[PDB]
Amino acid sequence: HHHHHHRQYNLVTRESLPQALRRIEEAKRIALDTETTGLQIYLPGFELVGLAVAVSPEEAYYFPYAHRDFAGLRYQPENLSREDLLRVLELAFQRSVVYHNAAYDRQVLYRTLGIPFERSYGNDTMIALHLMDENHSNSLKEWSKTLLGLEESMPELPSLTDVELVDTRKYKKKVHKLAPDWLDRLKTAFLSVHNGGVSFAALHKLVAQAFNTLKARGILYYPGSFPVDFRYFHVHLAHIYALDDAMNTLALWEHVEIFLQLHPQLERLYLDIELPVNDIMTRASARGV
Ligand SMILES: Cc1cn([C@H]2C[C@H](O)[C@@H](COP(=O)(O)O)O2)c(=O)[nH]c1=O
Ligand SMILES: [Cl-]
Ligand SMILES: [Cl-]
Ligand SMILES: [Cl-]
Ligand SMILES: [Cl-]
Ligand SMILES: [Mg+2]
Ligand SMILES: [Mg+2]
Ligand SMILES: [Tb+3]
């Protein structure tokens, strides 16, 4: 685990899974966010990579499911099993659930884990916030800046290699070696711009920059460019990104229930029309629109 400015980020492992279940079980309201291989849920090869679960706006659990190590480096933790994630989801759905874009997450959970839409149903900050400000962007990062007061951030990577002089004519050649602490150096570059709501593009820029710097120094080789694939994003960085989405969604929900209490006209519009219609459209895409 890691505490970064009032927020507790927990990376779940097989060992720490029972504590994560104890914290979810204790929560009256949770937020769910899915991390995946792309925006198209119905493309062959689509996968759920990890699940973010916030038990409060300052406490969350990341459940790695299909993360992988890229270009021969060793940095990912051990992924949790399908049964482990289904235990998490059985527990999660026994309390109130909040999403930011429930149509995406619920279709991901159905397609990849077979979670019925009946259990999946929950609140959606993206729908309720559209009733607060119709002209505002649907982006969770953008709404976090507006209501939660997150600072603007739109990544300067340190040297991940140490130069060693190696006896080789009769001279000393400069050979770059991967620094033993390269992961802590990479986390430091990430933390120096971490505002509590770092964007996907920014996370990918740093991850890509990390691998490209190592490829440009002969440390590793991969054919082509660095893929826009969350499976390869270093979990010790990516779990912070994913967990902030879950914590921002729950923090935004606190603001939403205040707004809906002051406007029961919009609360009724949200509960009787918006959320049910969105559920209808979500189930229809899962069959084929
Ligand atoms: C924001 C974004 C997300 N995605 C995919 C990967 C993410 O793991 C998944 C969930 O997005 P999220 O980070 O907003 O929850 O959607 C993209 O493929 N491109 C994007 O620009
Ligand atoms: Cl895609
Ligand atoms: Cl695996
Ligand atoms: Cl169903
Ligand atoms: Cl040389
Ligand atoms: Mg999401
Ligand atoms: Mg996310
Ligand atoms: Tb309420």
Numbering used by the authors: 0 to 153, 157 to 170, 176 to 296
Show sentences the authors wrote.
The gene coding for ExnV1 originates from a metagenome collected within the Virus-X project. It has a length of 942 bp (corresponding to 314 residues), and sequence comparison using BlastP and the CDD revealed that ExnV1 only contains the putative 3′–5′ exonuclease domain typical of DNA polymerases I, indicating that ExnV1 may be a truncated DNA polymerase I. The crystal structure of ExnV1 contained one polypeptide chain and the overall structure was determined to 2.19 Å resolution using the co-crystallized terbium compound. The structure of PolI_G20c consists of two polypeptide chains, A and B, that could possibly be arranged as a dimer according to PISA structure analysis in CCP4mg. This specific structural motif, termed SβαR, consists of two rather long β-strands in ExnV1, followed by two α-helices corresponding to α-helices 7 and 8, with a very short β-strand 10 between them. ExnV1 was also investigated using the DALI server against the PDB. The search generated 13 matches with a Z-value above 20 and all of these models are Klenow fragments of DNA polymerase I from E. coli.
The structure of PolI_G20c was solved with the aid of the structure of an exonuclease termed ExnV1, which was determined in parallel in this work and originates from an Icelandic virus metagenome collected from several hot springs in Iceland. The gene coding for ExnV1 may be part of a truncated gene that originally encoded a DNA polymerase I. A novel structural motif, SβαR, that was not previously associated with DNA polymerases I was identified in the solved structures of ExnV1 and PolI_G20c. Residues 152–185 are missing in chain B of PolI_G20c; however, the residues corresponding to those in ExnV1 are present and from the sequence alignment it is interpreted that PolI_G20c also resembles ExnV1 in this area, which is part of a novel structure motif (SβαR) that is discussed further below. The major difference between the two proteins is that ExnV1 only comprises the smaller 3′–5′ exonuclease, whereas PolI_G20c also includes the larger palm domain that is responsible for the polymerase activity.
